[PDB]
Amino acid sequence: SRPLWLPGSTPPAHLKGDLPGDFGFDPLGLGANAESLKWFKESELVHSRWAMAAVAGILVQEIVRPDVFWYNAGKEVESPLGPLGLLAVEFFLMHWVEVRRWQDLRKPGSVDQDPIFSQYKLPPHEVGYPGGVFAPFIPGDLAELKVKEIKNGRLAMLAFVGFVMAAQVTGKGPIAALQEHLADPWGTTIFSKAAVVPGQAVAPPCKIPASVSYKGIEIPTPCFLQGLWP
Amino acid sequence: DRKLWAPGVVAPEYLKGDLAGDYGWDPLGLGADPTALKWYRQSELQHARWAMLGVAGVLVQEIVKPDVYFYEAGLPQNLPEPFTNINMGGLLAWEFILMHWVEVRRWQDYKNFGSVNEDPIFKGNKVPNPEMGYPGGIFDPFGFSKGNLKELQTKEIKNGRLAMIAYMAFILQAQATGKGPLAALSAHLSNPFGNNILKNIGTCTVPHSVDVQGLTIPLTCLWPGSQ
Amino acid sequence: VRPVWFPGNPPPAHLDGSLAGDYGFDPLFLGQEPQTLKWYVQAELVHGRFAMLGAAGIILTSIGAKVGLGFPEWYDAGKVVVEKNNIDFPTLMVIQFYLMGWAETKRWYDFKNPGSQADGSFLGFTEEFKGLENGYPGGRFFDPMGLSRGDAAKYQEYKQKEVKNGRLAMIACLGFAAQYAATGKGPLDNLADHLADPNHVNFATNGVSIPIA
Numbered sequence A: 001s002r003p004l005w006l007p008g009s010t011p012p013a014h015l016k017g018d019l020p021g022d023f024g025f026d027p028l029g030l031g032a033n034a035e036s037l038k039w040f041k042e043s044e045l046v047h048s049r050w051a052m053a054a055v056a057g058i059l060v061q062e063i064v065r066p067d068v069f070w071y072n073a074g075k076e077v078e079s080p081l082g083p084l085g086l087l088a089v090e091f092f093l094m095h096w097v098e099v100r101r102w103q104d105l106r107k108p109g110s111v112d113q114d115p116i117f118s119q120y121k122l123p124p125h126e127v128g129y130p131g132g133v134f135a136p137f138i139p140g141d142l143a144e145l146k147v148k149e150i151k152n153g154r155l156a157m158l159a160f161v162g163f164v165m166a167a168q169v170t171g172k173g174p175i176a177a178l179q180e181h182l183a184d185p186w187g188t189t190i191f192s193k194a195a196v197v198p199g200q201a202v203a204p205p206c207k208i209p210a211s212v213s214y215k216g217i218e219i220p221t222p223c224f225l226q227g228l229w230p
Numbered sequence B: 001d002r003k004l005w006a007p008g009v010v011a012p013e014y015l016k017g018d019l020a021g022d023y024g025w026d027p028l029g030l031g032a033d034p035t036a037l038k039w040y041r042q043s044e045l046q047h048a049r050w051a052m053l054g055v056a057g058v059l060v061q062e063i064v065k066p067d068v069y070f071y072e073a074g075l076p077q078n079l080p081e082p083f084t085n086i087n088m089g090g091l092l093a094w095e096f097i098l099m100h101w102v103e104v105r106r107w108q109d110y111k112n113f114g115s116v117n118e119d120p121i122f123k124g125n126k127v128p129n130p131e132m133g134y135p136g137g138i139f140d141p142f143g144f145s146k147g148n149l150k151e152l153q154t155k156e157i158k159n160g161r162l163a164m165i166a167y168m169a170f171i172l173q174a175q176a177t178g179k180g181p182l183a184a185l186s187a188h189l190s191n192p193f194g195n196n197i198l199k200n201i202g203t204c205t206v207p208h209s210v211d212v213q214g215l216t217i218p219l220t221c222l223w224p225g226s227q
Numbered sequence C: 001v002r003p004v005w006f007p008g009n010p011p012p013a014h015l016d017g018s019l020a021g022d023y024g025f026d027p028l029f030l031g032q033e034p035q036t037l038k039w040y041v042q043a044e045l046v047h048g049r050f051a052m053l054g055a056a057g058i059i060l061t062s063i064g065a066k067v068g069l070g071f072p073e074w075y076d077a078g079k080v081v082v083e084k085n086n087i088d089f090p091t092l093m094v095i096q097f098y099l100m101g102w103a104e105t106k107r108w109y110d111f112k113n114p115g116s117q118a119d120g121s122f123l124g125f126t127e128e129f130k131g132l133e134n135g136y137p138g139g140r141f142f143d144p145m146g147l148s149r150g151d152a153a154k155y156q157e158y159k160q161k162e163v164k165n166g167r168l169a170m171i172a173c174l175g176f177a178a179q180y181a182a183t184g185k186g187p188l189d190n191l192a193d194h195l196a197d198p199n200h201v202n203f204a205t206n207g208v209s210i211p212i213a
């Protein structure tokens, strides 16, 4: 009745199309439990929203600041606030924000009131979709917008993972790697730099240094599951 | 009343001539399960159709390019000038992506008949798909399906079965004699008695392994022939 | 009806197919008594679950060794970890038996008196230790994703999958030990040798398994 991930298939019983982006994909049945789906619904939005912001940032960094490698931005960046000064502000600010979001997930409608200012309050809303101050402007129908958000978000989540493995294998940024693909599309695919057959296995070399020296300490920098690479 | 594979042999109950090219031949009784018979029928069509392309390719390629020795044609250095020494990794990438799409579409048709007839991108386009394994429509531009379809199915499977046997003759002959199909045929005519299977059967001419752009690929013959 | 380990042999009376992975294999009638069968059903799962962790760990580290990442073989990891990290073996052993003893004693008295560990005695937790079946704790701690609280049909399918991968892992862990004793090389070192020359490199030619060879 609705488009599915695999056309012609029957969606699992626990999936019925109520949620946005519900295309009936759940081969392992992780969403069968009602409470588990409610939690997994929140994490998908949070993961997607973080990924979209992260993917946009990495692309903009390379265009604006081509010299700096987004992978090495952790050590490359220098600021007066120092390493542990930045972390301190980040921890406390994120601890407040995340706990309040977490509380609404458990008991919705309890953390809508503004603590400091009495008059201001968050209108009634659904879990994971705060309104009011967070949404000053809405281009159109929310139902359509929610589907747009998740579909772009799901793509962004894959996009970020593409950056990491491309960065670890090719040792380059996202746009820089793409330019390499366009130069020699046949000789740059993962098939054209790695292969495993009975008796032999060839894998790309991890182009990220094993360890990083950062202000008198050594930070391990391992390639993700480098032993299982193709 | 149809003729059977052997004289005076009783055909299995589940083989009653519904399918084309039905001689009532199933010594292992693999078609007893009705669902299994459908799947095996599809694989017979796939082997039949791929094998016919394989036989045609080997023979035609031999005529146009006698020296290529199709058995070795897979090596990158033997490819035509435009594609000579192409990166096999990138070349495989095209086939995997394109074949994965096409074959999953065919597979989904078997799982749920008639579900994948319509074009996904351009709405409206469809194929008739009168029977599983016979999409028709765009796959039959000349419209030969119209008419005596049953007879055409019989002709397809009978020729396809012959191709399967014929192609594996090419492979074993190349492994034993080291020559292509037409080349081996000429050799037999020259010296029918001196040059035949009785002599060549004991030798396997395939090297143990080959190096394809730095990757070692194991190779084997279909019998423990004297290397 | 249902398949059995020895085709044509009727299954034993005490094995009725209700349990997961039941193929009517009990030639010595070790589980004829119903109460003893409960004990062994859980013993098999604990053995199977540990073997799966052991086999996966041994395989993964062996891949690290072959690829050159520097991992030691499973039969040398214990010595390497202790020496490289400067760990007192007797202290590490004692810590293990405190943590295993507490966790595994709780599993022991849940078998004796089911539901006894969910009385709130342990830090006030009253529902995470109740238990679903014999050998299947369930709950939001041991089953955080709630795959045992969703579809009932698929949960029974997983129980079949868990036991069979567990039995396969148990056999594999015996293979690692037997292969090391016969060959003295790592797991994947043996696999590489077999793929090189399968005909002339296997147990029938190692000079140990078949002494009359």
Ligand code: CHL
Binding pocket: A198, B070, B071, B072, B073, B074, B075, B076, B088, B091, B092, B095, B210, B212, B217, B218, B219, B220, B221
């Ligand atoms: C119908 C398909 C097909 C057939 C029949 C052949 C047949 C042949 N090719 Mg050719 N090729 C085929 C497709 C292709 N070849 C090549 C590329 C090559 C090369 C580069 C070479 C050959 C060679 C050979 C020979 C292999 C002898 C042997 O024992 O191999 C079988 C050996 C094996 C190790 C594989 C046996 C198992 C099975 C066939 C593969 C299945 C793999 C699974 C999909 C992997 C799945 C992994 C899991 C984890 C998901 C033989 C003449 C060799 C040759 O000319 O030798 C003189 C050679 O060097 N082929 C490509 C890439 C474009 C193909 C793409 O479809």
Ligand code: CHL
Binding pocket: A070, A071, A072, A073, A074, A075, A076, A083, A086, A087, A090, A091, A208, A212, A214, A219, A220, A221, A222
């Ligand atoms: C989403 C978060 C995040 C991610 C994905 C990365 C990712 C990366 N950083 Mg970056 N960083 C992140 C946040 C931060 N980094 C830094 C500071 C640095 C530095 C100084 C360096 C990197 C480096 C790297 C790279 C290698 C990482 C590695 O191998 O670590 C291996 C693993 C670890 C070192 C520890 C892992 C910790 C664990 C995942 C989470 C721990 C949680 C805390 C205990 C909870 C309390 C903290 C609060 C904030 C929640 C990689 C691209 C390195 C680089 O450039 O390599 C080329 C590098 O030198 N990052 C800061 C500022 C404090 C961050 C703040 O959020």
Ligand code: CHL
Binding pocket: C097, C098, C099, C100, C101, C102, C105, C106, C109, C121, C122
């Ligand atoms: C009369 C004494 C007495 C005895 C012999 C026991 C014996 C036992 N009690 Mg205990 N209890 C006793 C009194 C009491 N118990 C309880 C309440 C409970 C509960 C609720 C439970 C037990 C359990 C157990 C068993 C734990 C088995 C094990 O391996 O523990 C291993 C021991 C430990 C892990 C803790 C001790 C570790 C070490 C010796 C001390 C370390 C201290 C350091 C500060 C550590 C710091 C490390 C950090 C920094 C990394 C064991 C049979 C458990 C059990 O098995 O129940 C079925 C259980 O759940 N008892 C109360 C309160 C009413 C008691 C009051 O007198």
Ligand code: CLA
Binding pocket: A050, A053, A054, A056, A057, A058, A060, A061, A064, A065, A068, A073, A074, A076, A077, A079
């Ligand atoms: C997940 C988000 C994220 C993270 C963690 C980073 C992290 C980083 N960025 Mg990137 N960036 C992002 C998103 C992100 N960026 C996005 C979305 C964009 C497009 C607008 C950019 C554009 C960008 C540029 C152009 C540059 C960086 C740079 C940097 C580095 C230094 C930052 C600095 O000095 O700030 C100092 C901080 C300030 C001066 C004040 C910032 C105040 C902000 C705007 C408040 C935003 C609040 C708002 C509620 C956030 C909503 C989204 C959020 C929830 C994800 C650092 C590695 C620099 C770099 O490459 O260094 C090597 C750099 O030049 N980023």
Ligand code: CLA
Binding pocket: B197, B198, B199, B200, B201, B202, B203, B223, B224, B225, B226
């Ligand atoms: C029971 C049948 C049988 C068996 C078990 C063997 C066993 C063996 N043969 Mg012998 N062989 C046989 C029959 C058999 N042969 C016959 C009938 C012929 C005449 C065609 C030969 C001709 C022959 C040669 C030329 C060589 C061997 C060799 C070998 C060795 C294996 C390597 C090899 O290349 O074999 C290849 C052999 C075959 C593929 C024959 C398969 C026969 C099948 C199993 C029986 C049915 C055949 C059927 C009637 C069709 C016959 C041909 C047809 C045109 C009429 C091995 C000791 C090799 C050797 O001496 O190594 C030191 C070797 O070089 N055999």
Ligand SMILES: CC(/C=C/C=C(C)/C=C/[C@@]12O[C@]1(C)C[C@@H](O)CC2(C)C)=C\C=C\C=C(C)\C=C\C=C(C)\C=C\[C@@]12O[C@]1(C)C[C@@H](O)CC2(C)C
Binding pocket: B025, B026, B027, B028, B029, B030, B046, B047, B048, B050, B051, B053, B054, B055, B056, B057, B058, B061, B070, B071, B073, B074, B164, B165, B167, B168
């Ligand atoms: C698909 C196939 C061949 C495909 C070949 C292709 C694509 C070749 C391509 C290329 O060559 C070219 C063109 C040019 C070269 O340069 C490159 C390559 C790539 C090499 C053969 C199948 C070949 C398939 C064969 C031979 C199958 C035979 C099956 C039989 C006899 C089964 C019999 C029974 O099962 C029944 C039916 C019923 C039971 O009751 C009883 C028993 C007896 C068990």
Ligand SMILES: CC(/C=C/C=C(C)/C=C/[C@@]12O[C@]1(C)C[C@@H](O)CC2(C)C)=C\C=C\C=C(C)\C=C\C=C(C)\C=C\[C@@]12O[C@]1(C)C[C@@H](O)CC2(C)C
Binding pocket: C025, C026, C027, C028, C029, C030, C047, C048, C050, C051, C053, C054, C055, C057, C058, C073, C074, C075, C076, C077, C078, C170, C171, C173, C174
């Ligand atoms: C084979 C086995 C049991 C087999 C039992 C059989 C056939 C029983 C058969 C029968 O009884 C039946 C059913 C019914 C009866 O009527 C008849 C018989 C015939 C009597 C158990 C293996 C059980 C195997 C187990 C539990 C293995 C656990 C392994 C672990 C934890 C390994 C850990 C580590 O390897 C790491 C990960 C990293 C390393 O560096 C360090 C170490 C510590 C080595």
